[PDB]
Design a protein around this nucleic acid. Structure first.
Ligand SMILES: [Ca+2]
Length: 1158
DNA sequence: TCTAATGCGAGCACTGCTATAGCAGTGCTCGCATTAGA
């Protein structure tokens, strides 16, 4: 509690409301969480226990990373599973669980509560801050105002930009030249506005110290300014007199130079700008009898004269709501909104029902990484858990590791929270690291008081663990110290030098380690165990993409391969993408001589200058490559981009060759990665060209997702690893290098946190008091970064130090090294001589801490060899293709195009297809009814459920046409059409659909015929011919061998008192008129679409079906069917026109039926 | 086949004056760090 937290003993920590746990670097934050979790599930503890035992769905644990929750969740399903087993056994011989066991009172019961929890884990309330938010939101959607169906907006950077241009458009275009020019001089365009405000606009809006009056228009301020400007433009258009008497030295007569300038600064304004008229003022006039009445210049140079704060203020207020409105309209949600709307929800009046709701679901909650919260979160958290009995709020984290300033993480809202909760705790021991390492860090950050210079972030030392007392690092002889400062010489030192030199030094010391390690003289030792240092143990922490390169370079210069683990580039701007783009163009059109030559020229294909030339002179060889490429397009068109690309590669033997070519692995895996992306994108485009286009776009405007990020190679694991301070939080490394840990960069933007109210304030006038406050907050941050930096190592760490100077003040005992975190701890605060550094370092310095001077080096080798025995081969299978079983359906016939057609709509009028034109003739006849399948299946629909029996309501019909989206005005023609077709004589004898009651029809029957013994198109042809006069029009056997099944739909099967029939309604073709629906023409079309096949198949179906249903049925006493109504060509009085009938041989069905089974 | 960043001061050169030297200010050349971080 109170002052200097208590050394948290997990097992006795009071799980009752509000506890702040500080877990220093390497202290067990994770082991502790776990323990606590178990304690809560089994309501263990004592007077320090929680009131009741909780469930998995009640222990709220929030983490920051998606990866964090996963890990955390994985770690907990394990401690449960174990504490549980150790509960059946009632014995544990491993730390935590034993002490816990001691605390348990009915092992038998725990084991069942635990077993339940284990089973529940797929729902543990372990979420990310955002996850926690959309959940509380979605449940209580009425309080929050949420939609039940939201779309998680992902970008928002483009949404923001667009809002920003809209802003500019509606606020600048309409502006008159005088104001316009002014704005223009403040920002050339909306891109530059955003550049100045983009940070804000995101997350909580800062408070503006001194905003403009809630109404000043651009127009107004302008006035005031102009007017302040011209009144002084008048009292100068009178330089008649200014030609003055009494002297001074500085002030020369080349003042007549200064003069005219402003005399001529009398344009029609348009710019708040005004080159220097220092001399002719009056404030200095005296500072250099003296001057007269232009004390109006003393007044112009007092008041700022700018449009800046005014426009800015307006922009963010507005740009924000543009973004907002847009996101609502689209129906979306960004991440900041998720937890933002949850804040506004706990603050609305309807905020108690909500706080209570939540508080009930989650009585106790563990917030991890808490040092990285921000006003919005904290507020969500106290409003729900603060001062609330029957609940507990464990906030665990470490203020010394709060480095996410740039994202939104507020160290001040952490410091406030620290004020509001009174129970403080700390983890005292540093498992994970060597004692010297632990000692020198503690020493370093112990120098001055308030090392992190914010009394609220006090630094308390830590003890090193016993299990690690034996760790030590030896090199070419004896134990090296845990922390070594390398120190450049000289008095001054620019940022550019201290880098070239430091990167140099750092790479040198690395091969020196690395090769002394191949020889056994650099050992990582734990007591009497030792292993040589490999590259997988060196690690270089770095502050930016540039520094990293600077390192990779000096390292590469010694042949020492490296990896920048924090690399963000995308695979789309890799040069390999460009080549893939040429390659695809080539494939999509090898016709164009030029675009192919380019693809063959890409380095990826590995050709020669001699190669390219000769292929240009050998026209037969070229058309060979052209075929090869036509071959690829084909695979592309059928199987995909990946499949095509793999074909190409196997041919030009790409992967094999590339890998042989230095750095060729990088390239090869990027190429594959592009293909994996290229393949998804293709399944969302129905053209190859579209994809190509898809590539270009991604090559011209990249860095989108984390998905187009570069994948790291398996092996990068044996490369020295160069990472950023940020990606290193969490990570552990045997040895680490800090080549540029002394750099600073003065904060110049006045965005600071108020020292008393702890809120964020943006000062739109760089008032020095605020920039000063901002700057403090800047090293307040670098110290935290330094603390994360020193802390990743286990055995050793060495950082580069230099008498760094940035002030262009001529080495005035400068060395503003005291403005860097490391500099501030070394020089205890006060600035020093370039030599005063050297003496401070020496000052804290024995075995644990030591220094050497930047001893540069050279020796291009990393003298390491190889050996290799590729004794490989691949399993070849000895089974073979043989036969294919399938489910077909009179598709053995109808060639594709129907790909996915029969799939999306199982009953589409597949028999139709096409457009319709200038056949409009001003009097509707059934031949002018919309052509094709959509309309075609509209018809079939008509006859699916009718009352063939009664007459045709025309209302009913107007409704069918109205619902199916056809013009009502078709009702006259259609109703007249339906009846005609109902009242026609199919088989002369009675017949006529109209005589068929329900009980005698079966619409759309669906059959499945097994067809064993492949059905060879030929063998079926012979008998089809013999028995059918129609199929005598012999082009058939157009399909290929198929064993399997045979699907099929029968439009209608009806009976006419003894005698079953097969009806097939066929809306079909727009062949002008009548002349096309006569017994031949039909019989004609019949063969065109080989529909004859359909009959025979369909009746073999009806045959089998009837035979199966009608016990003791005979084909020729019950069948006699097959009617084919070409719906069009059907008149009330022109029978045998439109209708077609057949009655399969009965001798055909016979053979046919057994042609299936044998 | 196209273009190719600013900007800030220094840094040295030179030019009035006026109680040879320091205080000042005019002007072109040039080197330097800039970004960051998920
Ligand atoms: Ca049909």
């Amino acid at each position: 509690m109170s002052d200097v937290a208590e050394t948290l003993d997990p097992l006795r920590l009071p799980l009752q409301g509000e506890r702040l746990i500080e877990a220093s670097a390497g202290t067990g934050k994770t082991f502790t969480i776990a323990a606590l979790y178990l304690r809560l599930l089994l309501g263990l503890g004592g007077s320090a226990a929680f009131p009741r035992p909780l469930t998995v769905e009640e222990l709220l644990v929030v983490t920051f990373t998606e990866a964090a929750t996963a890990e955390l969740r994985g770690r907990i399903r394990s401690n449960i599973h174990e504490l549980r087993i150790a509960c059946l056994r009632e014995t544990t011989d491993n730390p935590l669980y034993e002490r816990l066991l001691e605390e348990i009172d009915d092992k038998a019961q725990a084991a069942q509560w635990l077993l339940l929890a284990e089973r529940q884990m797929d729902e543990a309330a372990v979420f990310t801050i955002h996850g926690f938010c959309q959940r509380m939101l979605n449940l209580n959607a009425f309080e929050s105002g949420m939609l039940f169906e939201q779309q998680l907006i992902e970008d928002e950077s483009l949404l923001r930009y667009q809002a920003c241009a809209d802003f500019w458009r509606r606020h600048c275009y309409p502006l008159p030249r005088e104001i316009a020019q002014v704005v223009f001089e403040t920002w050339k365009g909306p891109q530059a506005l955003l550049r100045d405000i983009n940070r804000y606009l995101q997350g909580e809006a800062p408070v503006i110290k001194a905003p403009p009056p809630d109404d000043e228009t651009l127009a107004s301020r302008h006035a005031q300014i102009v007017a302040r400007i011209d009144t002084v433009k008048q009292q100068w258009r009178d330089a008649v007199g200014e030609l003055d008497a009494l002297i001074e030295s500085s002030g020369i007569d080349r003042r007549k130079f200064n003069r005219s300038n402003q005399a001529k600064w009398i344009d029609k304004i348009s710019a708040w700008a005004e080159e220097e008229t220092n001399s002719y003022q009056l404030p200095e006039s005296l500072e250099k009898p003296r001057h007269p009445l232009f004390e109006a210049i003393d007044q112009l140079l007092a008041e700022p004269l700018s449009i800046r704060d005014l426009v800015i203020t307006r922009a963010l207020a507005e740009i924000r709501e543009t973004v907002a409105r847009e996101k609502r309209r689209r129906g979306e949600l960004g991440f900041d909104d998720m937890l933002s709307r949850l804040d506004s929800a706990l603050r609305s009046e309807s905020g108690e029902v909500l706080a209570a709701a939540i508080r009930t679901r989650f009585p106790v909650a563990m917030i991890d990484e808490f040092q990285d919260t921000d006003p919005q979160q904290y507020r969500i958290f106290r409003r729900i858990w603060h001062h609330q009995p029957e609940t507990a709020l464990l906030l665990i984290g470490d203020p010394k590791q709060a480095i996410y300033a740039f994202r939104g993480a507020d160290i001040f809202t952490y410091m406030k929270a620290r004020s509001e909760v009174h129970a403080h705790y700390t983890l005292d021991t540093n498992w994970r690291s060597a004692p010297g390492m632990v000692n020198s860090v503690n020493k370093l950050f112990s120098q001055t008081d308030d090392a992190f210079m914010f009394r609220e972030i006090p630094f308390i030392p830590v003890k090193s663990a016993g299990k690690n007392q034996a760790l030590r690092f030896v090199f070419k002889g004896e134990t090296q110290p845990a922390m070594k400062m390398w120190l450049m010489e000289g008095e001054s030192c620019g940022v550019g030098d201290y880098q070239s030199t430091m990167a140099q030094v750092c790479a040198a010391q690395i091969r020196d380690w690395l090769q002394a390690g191949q020889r056994g003289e650099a050992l990582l030792m734990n007591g009497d165990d030792a292993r040589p240092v490999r590259a997988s143990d060196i690690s270089v922490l770095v502050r930016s993409r540039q520094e990293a390169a600077q390192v990779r370079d000096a390292l590469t210069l010694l042949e020492i391969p490296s990896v920048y683990l924090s690399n963000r580039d995308s695979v789309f701007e890799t040069l390999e993408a460009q080549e893939m783009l040429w390659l695809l163009q080539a494939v999509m059109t090898p016709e164009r001589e030029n675009t192919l030559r380019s693809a063959l020229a890409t380095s990826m294909m590995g050709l020669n200058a001699l190669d390219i030339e000769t292929l240009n002179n050998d026209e037969h060889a070229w058309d060979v490559v052209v075929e090869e490429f036509d071959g690829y397009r084909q695979i592309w068109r059928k199987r995909g981009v990946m499949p095509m690309l793999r074909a190409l590669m196997s041919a030009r033997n790409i992967a094999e060759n590339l890998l042989a070519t230095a750095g060729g692995e990088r390239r090869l895996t990027d190429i594959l990665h592009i293909s994996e992306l290229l393949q998804e994108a293709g399944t969302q485009l129905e053209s190859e060209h579209a994809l190509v286009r898809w590539l270009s776009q991604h090559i011209l405007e990249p860095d989108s997702n984390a998905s187009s990020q570069q994948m790291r190679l398996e092996s990068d694991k044996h490369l020295v690893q160069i990472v950023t301070i940020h990606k290193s939080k969490g990570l552990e490394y045997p040895l680490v290098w800090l080549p540029f840990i002394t750099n600073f960069r003065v904060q110049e933007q006045a965005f600071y946190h108020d020292r008393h109210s702890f809120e964020a304030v943006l000062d739109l006038n760089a008032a020095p008091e605020s920039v000063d406050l901002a700057e403090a907050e800047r090293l307040a941050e670098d110290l935290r970064l330094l603390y994360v930096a020193l802390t990743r190592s286990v055995w050793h760490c060495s950082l580069g130090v230099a008498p760094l100077v940035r002030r262009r003040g001529d080495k005035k005992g400068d060395t503003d090294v005291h403005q860097s975190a490391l500099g501030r701890l070394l020089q205890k605060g006060e600035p020093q001589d370039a030599a005063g550094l050297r003496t401070c370092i020496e000052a804290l310095c024995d075995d644990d801490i030591a220094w050497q001077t930047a001893q540069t080096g050279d020796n291009q080798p990393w003298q390491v060899n190889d050996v290799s025995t590729a004794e490989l081969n691949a399993k070849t299978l000895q089974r073979l293709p043989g036969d294919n079983w399938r489910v077909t359906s009179y598709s053995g016939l109808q060639q594709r195009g129907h790909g996915i057609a029969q799939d999306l709509m199982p009953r589409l009028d597949v028999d139709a297809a096409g457009v319709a034109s200038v056949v409009e003739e001003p009097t509707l006849t059934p031949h002018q009814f919309p052509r094709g399948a959509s309309p075609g299946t509209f018809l079939h629909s008509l006859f699916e459920d009718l009352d063939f029996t009664q007459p045709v309501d025309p209302n009913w019909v107007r409704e069918k046409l109205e619902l199916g989206g056809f013009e009502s005005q078709w009702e006259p023609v259609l109703t007249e059409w339906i009846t005609a077709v109902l009242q026609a004589p199919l088989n002369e004898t009675g017949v006529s659909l109209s005589q068929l009651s329900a009980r005698n029809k079966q619409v759309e029957m669906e059959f499945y015929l097994p067809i064993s013994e492949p059905l060879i198109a030929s063998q079926l042809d012979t008998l089809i011919r013999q028995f059918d006069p129609l199929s005598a029009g012999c082009p058939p056997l157009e399909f290929m061998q198929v064993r399997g099944m045979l699907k099929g739909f029968i439009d209608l099967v009806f009976r006419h008192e003894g005698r079953y029939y097969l009806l097939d309604y066929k809306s079909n073709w727009l062949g002008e008129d009548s002349s096309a629906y006569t017994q031949q023409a039909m019989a004609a079309a019949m063969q065109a679409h080989r529909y004859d096949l359909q009959y025979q198949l369909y009746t073999l179906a009806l045959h089998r079906y009837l035979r199966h249903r009608i016990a003791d049925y005979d084909y020729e006493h019950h069948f006699g069917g097959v009617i084919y109504l070409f719906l069009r060509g059907v008149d009330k009085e022109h029978p045998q026109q439109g209708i077609y009938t057949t009655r399969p041989n009965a001798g055909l069905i016979a053979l046919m039926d057994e042609m299936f089974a044998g």
